[PDB]
Symmetry: C2
Subunit: 272 residues, 2 copies
């Protein structure tokens, strides 16, 4: 398809970031990564990839606002102030630092607060998920559709737990959700990168996905992918503030609805 | 080059099987999967990959015994009767049928019941894990080591829940196991192919792994990979009958010991 210029800029920026990340991982597989130096090696790769993305974006749009995982939020100016790029230069950091080849670059563009363009790029598998509002979604140029599955029977769901200490008090809640889904589904997967879980919803590889504790840069692009593939995205209450609240349900039509209903009785008032 | 001829035969057979499976997934992502036809399409692809592997093996060793996931157990003759090939032609069947690009061919060779050769091949990522007894393990020719991590602090563990009706009754123990691991670890992953989880333990990508409900062809090759990379493998009671019993713990030295210890209080009454 003929992509809008902004989507093409984001895609080329993701490609450069992903190639940098790929070279980085290749050296880190052949060397011992001390665990005291591991978090600093990760900070390095994040910031170098973020620099790559932001440099490419600002070469084309110097007046746009940028919100990066590493750099925070920097406002735009003039008309460009209505554009906000939401960047995770490396989604899946625990996988990356352990050498697990499942992670992605995630770039979204919001126009006046609504999702307008999205890229999720797997640089290992060379899988480029792209979308623009009203243009559909694609994997390496091919149109994407959510799966047709009519219920949770035999469904393949994605999920992921937030592993940091301040979510420990939610474990039973999560484990309750999980508990109630094991009977109906064919499987539940925790692969460790929410942007690729959403991308997989968009491509029909997962029938639905849910998670809490996420940040905006992990979910923004993938949510647009799911929407443009004909799916649904909400927070745990069925409203559209998933980006701000950190909990998200995405899926095809019927499996989104069923998954939302299923998880309702286990929601803490914290996540309501 | 450095490989013994028997290991090279197994590796070439795995490559051919993997190319067949890869072409298959490519046709099934762009076409509708009825789901009435899903079990028949997977059976078709399994049997074609198994035929590919078995034809390659028997062209070199016609008197060896063969045990395929699709096919039965067929004994050998003469000295060759002491050799048994243990084949899962396509590990990760739920992933495969949904288009999730994470699955592998698994081929092990046992000599008088002891693991002698092993191949786990990821045809999407083109990752060839090979090992021979007393020869070490390799990823695409590069020698492999288990990670050096000394405890579960910050560890990345793999596991799989078993989804069948006949394991539903073990779920609570599992969710208990999971609970006791959430505080210390950086993550737990359920990617959906036990052979690649074991391969990732061998390569240092996971620090440890546990799962029950597996079949021999799921575990055999990956178990040799972990052993030859310097790790430890046992069943849930610490003995070496994981292949017959279907439950397995694998890991680097200290994380293997800690994970086995952690899961002892959660064993269902069968296991003491």
């Amino acid at each position: 398809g003929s992509m809008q210029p902004m989507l093409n800029i984001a895609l080329r920026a993701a490609r450069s970031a992903g190639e940098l990340i790929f070279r980085s991982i290749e050296r880190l597989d052949v060397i011992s990564v001390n665990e005291k130096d591991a978090k600093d090696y990760v900070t390095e790769v994040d910031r170098a990839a973020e620099q790559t993305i932001v440099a490419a974006l600002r070469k084309a749009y110097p007046t746009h606002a940028i919100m990066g995982e590493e750099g925070g939020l920097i406002e735009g100016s003039g008309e460009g102030a209505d554009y906000l790029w939401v960047i995770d230069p490396l989604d899946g950091t625990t996988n990356f630092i352990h050498g697990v080849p499942h992670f992605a670059v995630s770039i979204a563009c919001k126009y006046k607060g609504r999702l307008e363009h999205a890229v999720v790029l797997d640089p290992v598998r060379q899988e480029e998920f792209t979308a623009s509002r009203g243009r559909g979604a694609a994997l390496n140029g091919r149109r994407l559709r959510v799966s047709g599955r009519k219920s949770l029977e035999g469904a393949l769901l994605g999920t992921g737990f937030p592993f940091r200490d301040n979510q420990i008090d939610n474990l039973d809640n999560y484990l309750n959700m999980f508990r109630s889904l094991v009977g109906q589904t064919a499987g539940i997967r925790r692969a460790g990168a929410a942007s690729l879980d959403l991308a997989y919803v968009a491509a029909g590889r997962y029938d639905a996905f849910w998670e809490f504790g996420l940040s905006e840069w992990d979910m923004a692009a993938g949510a647009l992918l799911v929407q443009e593939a004909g799916g649904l995205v909400s927070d745990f209450t069925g409203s559209h503030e998933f980006l701000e609240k950190g909990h998200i349900v995405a899926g095809n039509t019927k499996c989104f609805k069923a998954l939302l209903t299923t998880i309702q009785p286990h929601l803490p008032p914290s996540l309501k």
